[PDB]
Curated annotation (Swiss-Prot):
Biological classification of the source: Eukaryota, Metazoa, Chordata, Craniata, Vertebrata
Modified residues (Phosphoserine): 207
Activity regulation behaviour: Activation of CDK1, appears to be an upstream event of AURKA activation. Phosphatase inhibitor-2 (PPP1R2) and TPX2 act also as activators. Inactivated by the G2 checkpoint. Inhibited by GADD45A and p53/TP53, and through dephosphorylation by protein phosphatase type 1 (PP1). MLN8054 is also a potent and selective inhibitor. Activated during the early phase of cilia disassembly in the presence of CIMAP3. Inhibited by the small molecule inhibitor VX-680.
Impact upon substituting residue 73 to N: Reduces interaction with TPX2. Reduces kinase activity tenfold. Promotes interaction with the AURKB binding partners INCENP and BIRC5 that are normally not bound by AURKA
Outcome, altering residue 30 to R: In a colorectal adenocarcinoma sample; somatic mutation; reduces interaction with TPX2
A GO BP entry: spindle assembly involved in female meiosis I
GO cellular component: axon hillock; basolateral plasma membrane; centriole; centrosome; chromosome passenger complex; ciliary basal body; cytosol; germinal vesicle
Protein name: Aurora kinase A
């Protein structure tokens, strides 16, 4: 007996798919614009077990940072689950990548700075993500990056998974440093570093950490990406060392 669908006005469809739909919406009383993610119960319980996608609402809801999409709350009815999300007006980093082909150094460094900050905050809360793709990075009103509520897709690939995870071995917070490296590279080059024609060859490249730089990538960029993509998790840097890297501080606007 709290938040309910009747408390909202529904707008245009942001996305539709096998698991549900997402719509623009506005709270009747307040009239504030937001997004409403509608998930079909017949899918959660069936496969994506409600277990995995449940309490994670309480953990996610407790995350409050300018670079993390806010989850205001949630509610349900007989057949659906409703997530009340912050609305990101400028779209995904993914679409922007389709548009520009590749980003410049100033834009790449700023984005990495905003990500490292969100991730450092998440670590202090004992929250670790499992692969972050360009399509899961939304853009705020001022153009800032927002890491979207990890999970709850409506319908991450092998290209973004660190070695320890695809190999089945143990993984920890250092998985986030590897992600940072795949992204930095993708922003500057236009495609992820281990891309291949088959899952077979992709795995091989990720496993053996096989990547190369086009001629236009700078030594400063090449040095950061190289420090981040270390097969051994322990060799990867702390998030603080990334925020203080000479190439970041030199091209970032903070």
């Amino acid at each position: 007996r709290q938040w309910a669908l009747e408390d909202f006005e529904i707008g245009r469809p942001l996305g539709k798919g096998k698991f549900g739909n997402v719509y623009l919406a506005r709270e009747k009383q307040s009239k504030f614009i937001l997004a409403l993610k509608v998930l079909f119960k017949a899918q959660l319980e069936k496969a994506g077990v409600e277990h995995q996608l449940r309490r994670e609402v309480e953990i996610q809801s407790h995350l409050r940072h300018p670079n993390i999409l806010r989850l205001y709350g949630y509610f349900h009815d007989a057949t659906r689950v409703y997530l009340i999300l912050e609305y990101a007006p400028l779209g995904t980093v993914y679409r922007e990548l389709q548009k520009l082909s590749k980003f410049d150094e100033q834009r790449t460094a700023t984005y990495i700075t905003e990500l490292a900050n969100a991730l450092s905050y998440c670590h202090s809360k004992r929250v670790i993500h499992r692969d972050i793709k360009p399509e899961n990075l939304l853009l705020g009103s001022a153009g800032e990056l927002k890491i979207a509520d990890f999970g709850w897709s409506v319908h991450g690939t092998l290209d973004y998974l660190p070695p320890e995870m695809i190999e089945g071995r143990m993984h920890d917070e250092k998985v986030d440093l590897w992600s940072l490296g795949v992204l930095c590279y993708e922003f500057l080059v236009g495609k992820p570093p281990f891309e291949a024609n088959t899952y077979q060859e992709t795995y091989k490249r990720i496993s053996r950490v096989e990547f190369t730089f086009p001629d236009f990538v700078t030594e400063g960029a090449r040095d950061l990406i190289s420090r981040l993509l270390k097969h051994n998790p322990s060799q990867r840097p702390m998030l603080r060392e990334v925020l203080e890297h000479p190439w970041i501080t030199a091209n970032s606007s903070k």
